[PDB]
């Protein structure tokens, strides 16, 4: 069986200052297309395949391809996955849990560099050969999360820097946490990440959030991270404050609203500060199809 | 919901003395695909997204990738769309009625240059930032249309130049009319070119039509094309004649015929003279799927 | 309509001694998508059009783009088809009746060079205007193949090499044969090859095979494969051995199996050896949606 899934969203993407002679606003947009194959068994074993073609704006040529493939197999609650995958410190719950606007943006995520789903073609050649096994597994309120990338898998490991990361998650109704960590995040020899967060479902409507993370060589430092955010009906009001240990940075902050048009149909806005006292507003739609 | 539309076509295309060491005659033919992505709304309000895969023979790589996106939302006749946009001047009725042969060529269509919907990437960079906004909005038998396209959003907008353009059309059970109007056509300042067109079906076999065009700085300077078209059945006639304003240049010519072999399925074929006595003709078919 | 139809594939390459600081065992995988449009009509003539999306590891830029086109008529047990077309060499059966293991493999394939469906694009700018024509027709057990193709169509003919190829192929429940021959195979003037084979099921269970081949200007010379399967249940047992003329070559061979886990689902393994001693072996799974 084929199916197709994916979004689109458009808006006005704010960044104060951004350069001689060019617009500060200009109309940000992005239309995601999934491609899924799953092949099903009587021995209830699924395989699957995905592709994805992800269009920007802003994008070279003013074209669309499609990325590497995905390739999983599932069995029991347990996913092993190969090829491009999706990795363990990208992977786990909270970690973008303070993130706001039609963009979904904020600097009060991890401020580290690490392997990823990559969502499209790279003209550098650097993904060429890039190989990753993943294995998940979700023990009820429990996910667990594991990832091996070998970014280039022609040659001797011996010669490259391989990414491990592992994290889990548990949840109940009202305490949620998580926790991750990867050596050579990136393929850096050296640069070890962690992130432990926990959140507060203090009602049906509100959460409350801490996000801690150790951005291993980046210049950032360690960092943490607190966002909350409320429900009004259909309005979503979200807020956060982050800071990481880089001498002089300034506090990061944000405030931002979603609101739920109808099923499918988000509009979404924000305000945010950067660490560098960078101004970025946004306003815009997204829609799943 | 993503749905997939499209059409082939394949066919001769013979243009005389296309070339020294060059065939004249060769089988050229085209695949289009259409994604088409949308999000329906209890309000009335439809989102939606499309992306166009198309090979054409000849093209570079013998490859085949999609193009930039294009977004819509729709609400009681009322459509604004953003990114990659149909304009004014080439979405008005009438102004393509005289094409004819399986290509749905003519040099009766207007000389001039100017922006509309990019059905492919272009390797050349200058697409990679161009942006469209486009409304339409049809009052029953009357269509308006307005399109604005910036080639560059990034650059502050007084260094580079802007299209901007405006149509309507109208029609009842015989005759029909048609205008646009366009500035700075294709980024290319001081070029506006203009459109009015009518057309008389004098039947429900025949129709009759004229169309007159200010090409603004192309050095075919104003036309004229005179058409028309007789259905027979299954089969249907088309021939037009055209001249320009260009100092010594030839009337342009054509006559072809239609014949509808099954719902979806076109066999077309044309005989055509250009302005500077080209002479070019065809012989295919087109199948929608 | 449009459908869509693929797979997905991925295992263990292994190859012995493959270079210095090159990982002989890597993870190989593929995933094919294709795009069919077809447009059938009530006077019983089907459109067709073809589309393929295929992604194998170490591709360059680590991204997916579509082929160039295949498009087709086919009307009572006769199919004429234009553009990348399927040939006579590589449609005829048997041929690859050796092949195993998940990349299904063979070195008892034929040496030769010779056109075939272009599964992707091609970056040297070699097949923009590559453009061929073939019919295919299957008088019941009996089916016959013709192709042509021109390798650059824009060019007068006199100045470029087009290949020629017929087969046919014939088969009972329990005899098969078939034969193809192709000049000028390749585009390469004086490369002319041909291919002769039969097989006997000699159960439900069992078929043992032999491959003639005159491999044209290869250096490998006149070529014989003798091949043979036996399925046991939901497993098959496969195996091989080819010889070549060419002075010093090891004779080759092959042994392997395919697990049929579940309609759709394959798991296969080989282990090979070549002409110039080169060790391979495989194992993986295939699974269709
Ligand atoms: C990301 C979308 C895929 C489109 C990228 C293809 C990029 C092609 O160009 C790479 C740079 O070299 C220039 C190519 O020659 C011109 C190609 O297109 C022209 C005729 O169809
Ligand atoms: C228009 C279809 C998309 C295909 C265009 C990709 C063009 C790639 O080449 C651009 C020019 O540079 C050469 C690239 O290196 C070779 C690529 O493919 C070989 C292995 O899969
Ligand atoms: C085979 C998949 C299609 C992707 C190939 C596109 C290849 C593009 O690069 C060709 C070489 O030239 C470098 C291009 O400039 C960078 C492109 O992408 C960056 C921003 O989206």
Redesign the interface.
């Given at each position: 069986?084929?199916s197709?899934?994916?979004?689109?969203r458009?808006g006005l993407q704010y960044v104060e200052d951004r350069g001689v002679?060019?617009?500060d606003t200009?109309?940000s947009?992005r239309?995601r297309?999934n491609?899924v194959?799953?092949?099903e068994?009587?021995?209830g074993?699924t395989?699957?395949?995905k592709?994805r073609?992800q269009?920007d704006?802003?994008?070279?040529?003013?074209?669309?391809?499609?990325?590497?493939?995905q390739?999983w197999?599932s069995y029991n609650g347990v996913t092993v996955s190969?090829?491009?995958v999706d990795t363990a410190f990208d992977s786990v719950a909270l970690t973008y849990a303070s993130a706001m606007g039609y963009e979904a943006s904020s600097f009060g995520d991890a401020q580290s560099s690490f392997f990823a789903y990559?969502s499209?073609?790279?003209?550098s050649?650097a993904?060429?050969?890039?190989?990753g096994?993943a294995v998940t597994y979700s023990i009820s309120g429990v996910n667990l999360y594991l990832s091996y990338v070998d970014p280039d898998?022609?040659?001797?490991?011996s010669?490259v820097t391989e990414e491990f990361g592992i994290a889990a998650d548990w949840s109940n109704d009202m305490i949620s946490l998580a926790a991750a960590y990867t050596t050579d995040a990136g393929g850096i020899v050296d640069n070890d990440i962690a992130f432990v967060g926990a959140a507060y479902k203090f009602n049906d409507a509100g959460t409350v959030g801490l996000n801690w993370y150790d951005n291993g060589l980046s210049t950032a430092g360690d960092q943490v991270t607190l966002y909350g955010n409320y429900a009004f009906g259909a309005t979503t009001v979200r807020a956060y404050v982050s800071d990481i240990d880089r001498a002089g940075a300034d506090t990061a902050y944000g405030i931002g609203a979603d609101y739920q048009?109808?099923?499918?149909?988000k509009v979404s806005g924000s305000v945010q500060s950067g660490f560098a006292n960078e101004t970025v507003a946004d306003v815009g739609?997204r829609?799943?199809?």
């Open positions: 069986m084929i197709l899934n994916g979004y689109g458009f002679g060019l617009e200009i109309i947009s239309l297309i491609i194959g799953t092949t068994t009587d021995q074993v395989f699957g395949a592709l073609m269009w704006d802003g994008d070279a040529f003013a074209g669309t391809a499609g990325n590497a493939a390739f197999t190969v090829g491009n990559n499209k073609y790279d003209a050649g993904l060429d050969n890039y190989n096994i898998q022609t040659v001797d490991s010669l048009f109808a099923e499918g149909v739609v829609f799943d199809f």
